[PDB]
Design a protein around this ligand. Sequence first.
Ligand code: NI
Length: 412
Amino acid sequence: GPQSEPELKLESVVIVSRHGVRAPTKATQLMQDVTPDAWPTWPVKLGWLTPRGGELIAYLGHYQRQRLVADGLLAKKGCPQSGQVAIIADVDERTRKTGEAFAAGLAPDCAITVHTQADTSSPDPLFNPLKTGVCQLDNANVTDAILSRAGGSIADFTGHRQTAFRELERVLNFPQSNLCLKREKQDESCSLTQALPSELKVSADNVSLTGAVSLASMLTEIFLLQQAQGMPEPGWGRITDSHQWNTLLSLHNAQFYLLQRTPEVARSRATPLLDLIKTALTPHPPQKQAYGVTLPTSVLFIAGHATNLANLGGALELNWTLPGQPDNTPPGGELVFERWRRLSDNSQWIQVSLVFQTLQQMRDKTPLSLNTPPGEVKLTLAGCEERNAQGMCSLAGFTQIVNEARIPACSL
Ligand code: NI
C-alpha cells in the first residue's frame, strides 16, 4: 500500500557506544569504610564485561539491524557485504567484547571483525590522546574553566548538592559506617562531604576530583550497574523509587559535567574521535584507513567509554538528558551520527541522536525491536548555522564545527 513519501535517504551511520555492563573496576578500603554493609560480589573479574552486559549490547545490535533495514541501508536477510559494516574497539576486554556483542546482534554468525590497534596491551590514543602524551592540557585554562562550571569552587559545588549526598548517605547507612563510628568525635553529625573534602587536581594528562565527589560518582554508578545486572537488591534494598535513582545518579552526572564535558578538556580528549567520525561521514571514494578499515562505508560501530561520549558532547555542544535512564552516559549508550541525503536537491545532512536502554529495559533484560525500541533523544549541534526542517546540520556546517572544535595538537 502507499507509504510515507521518502524525504531523506539514509546513507551512512557512525555509532559511538559505551561498553556494556562491566564489573566494578576496584574494591577499595574507602568503599569498605563508608558502609557497614557488604558490597555484593560480581560474576567476573574486576572491570570485565558481564555475560548479561553482552546480551544487553546484542539487543541494541539486533534493534539497529531492524531499523537500518527499515531505512534501506542494510539487507533484510544475509550477511552484510564485506566492509559494509565495520567495528572498531578500544583495547580493553570490555570494549572488544562489546564490539563482538553488537556484531552478534546486528549480524549473527557473520563473523564481522572487531578491529583494534595492533598492541592490545597498550593504551590506544584514539580513545584518549592525553594518556599516551600526544598532547597536554593547559593547566591554568582547565583549572579556571572547571572551577567556574562548578559554581566557583568545589565547596560551592557540593553545597548545592547536599540533598543528593544525604540521599547517598541514607543508601550507604553511612552513619553506622566505620568512617563515621571512628570519627573525632562523637558529638558532631557525620557528613560525607566533610569527612572526605574534595579538591580539583589538574595535570598535563588528566583531571580528577578527590574525596566525596569522586567517591559518590563511583558508588552511584555501582548501584546503577547492580540494577542493570539484575542483582536482587541494589543498594542493600534501600533504593526503592525512581526519584531516588535520579537523585543518586545526579552526583555521577555532575562529575562528568565538570571533568569530561568542560570544553577545555573535552575538545583535546575528543580530537582523534572527531577526525575518525568526520572521516567516516564524508562522501569519498572508499579507502583503507585507520585500523585497516575501509572508509567511508555503511555502518561504523566504535566501542569506547562514557568519557568518550561526554567528551564528544562537550566538544560538539550536544546536550542531553535521558528519560528513564538516570545515567547521562549509560552502559551501551550510543551517540549516533547519520549522514542523510535530501531527495529534493540531493544535499547532504548530519543528524545526531543518543540511543540508550532505559534502566527498566536493562533491569528487565527487555529484548529490543521496532515495536519495543530503546530510548532515543534527538540532539542539536548548538553551533550549527545551517539546519534543515528536521534539525540536521548541513554537511558543510558540520565540517566547520568539527574543524573549529578539534585541537590540531591532539590529532593522530
Ligand atoms: Ni553557586
